[PDB]
Design a protein around this ligand. Structure first.
Ligand code: NA
Length: 355
């Protein structure tokens, strides 16, 4: 790879792997819009199967960026509007407490304290309905941000209703296929399983467990190559020829809410660049209930931004960040869930060196 990339990746990631005992890792650096790939370690420890450019990793919450873009594409298609009440798409939620909860609120975790997880016992649509009906809001809609799978998971499920497609089928047809993500899956086909890394959690070989709204919240598995393509697509939305998808990507990177120095997009989270790295390395906002300021109209994607998302499942840790104005980005995929500050510090060190 270009030597500037060689040196910073080597000096940054090699220590990280050793420090965190990561079994296998893949990194892509997008530099002047072009991808460069790096791989370390093992997709299967026992069988000493190396991580490759074809290795599939669980993206965890980075999947929410796909959900946000799919939602954006639906808005651009005129199928849904973010101001639409939830009850338009699920009339059975009609109640005073669901008054004024809109798709926007679901997409951006501002519905008023929807739970962090959908309960393990929820398996049927009837179970799901009871869960959302019985929920007791902590706050008025559009006042507090509380990051939650039950919020964006519902958004994803409702956003696709007017399409007449399942969530998986919509994602495939409207996002994966046009962007040429041919090794990105919600459900890994049996013949592709050969590429699926084991995750490792405290020594156990594990894969993500099925759960309600999993596809919408943390469902995606992908390769380092496809993730690089995802970053390229998000860096340069104008390059995408399918108009609604182009528009959808731009809508997902718009700033709908602000808290402290941080902004909420659809799936994507953002800050103005340059950032103070302490506040994203030691992020005190992301996982806390924080008051938010609405931005109306939402600020179109700002080019001088740090746009990012972190993800984890039981056995995997992922991170994506990019800076549109610099044509620069990074994807880090690992088959161990390791702490967020170490991921973010590594990504910032690399991008800061290349900017
Ligand atoms: Na209730």
């Amino acid at each position: 790879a270009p030597q500037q990339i060689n040196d910073i990746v080597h000096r940054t990631i090699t220590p990280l792997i050793e420090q965190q005992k990561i079994p296998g890792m893949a990194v892509a650096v997008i530099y002047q819009g072009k991808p460069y790939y790096f791989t370390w370690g093992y997709a299967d420890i026992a069988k000493k199967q190396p991580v490759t450019q074809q290795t599939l990793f669980e993206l965890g919450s980075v999947s929410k960026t796909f959900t946000g873009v799919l939602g954006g594409d639906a808005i651009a298609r005129g199928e849904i509007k973010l101001s639409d009440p939830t009850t338009k798409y699920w009339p059975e939620l009609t109640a005073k407490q669901w008054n004024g909860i809109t798709l926007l609120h679901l997409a951006t975790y501002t519905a008023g304290g929807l739970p962090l997880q959908v309960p393990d016992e929820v398996k049927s649509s009837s179970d799901l309905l009871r869960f959302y009906q019985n929920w007791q809001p902590a706050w008025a809609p559009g006042t507090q941000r509380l990051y939650a799978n039950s919020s964006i998971g519902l958004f994803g499920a409702l956003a696709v209703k007017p399409s007449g497609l399942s969530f998986e089928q919509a994602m495939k047809t409207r996002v994966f296929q046009p962007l040429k993500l041919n090794h990105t899956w919600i459900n890994v086909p049996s013949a592709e399983e050969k590429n699926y890394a084991w995750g490792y959690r405290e020594g156990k070989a594990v894969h993500v467990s099925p759960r309600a709204l999993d596809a919408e919240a943390y469902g995606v598995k992908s390769t380092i190559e496809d993730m690089a393509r995802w970053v390229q697509s998000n860096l340069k939305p104008l390059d995408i020829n399918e108009k609604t998808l182009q528009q959808g990507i731009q809508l997902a990177q718009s700033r709908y809410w602000q808290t402290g120095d941080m902004y909420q997009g659809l799936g994507w989270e953002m800050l103005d660049w340059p950032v103070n790295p302490d506040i994203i390395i030691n992020n005190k906002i992301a996982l806390a209930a924080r008051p938010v300021k609405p931005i109306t109209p939402p600020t179109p994607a700002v080019r001088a931004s740090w746009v990012h998302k972190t993800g984890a499942t039981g056995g995997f840790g992922s991170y994506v960040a990019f800076i549109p104005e610099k044509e620069l980005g990074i994807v880090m995929l690992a088959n161990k869930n390791y702490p967020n500050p170490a991921r973010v510090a590594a990504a910032w060190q690399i991008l800061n060196a290349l900017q």
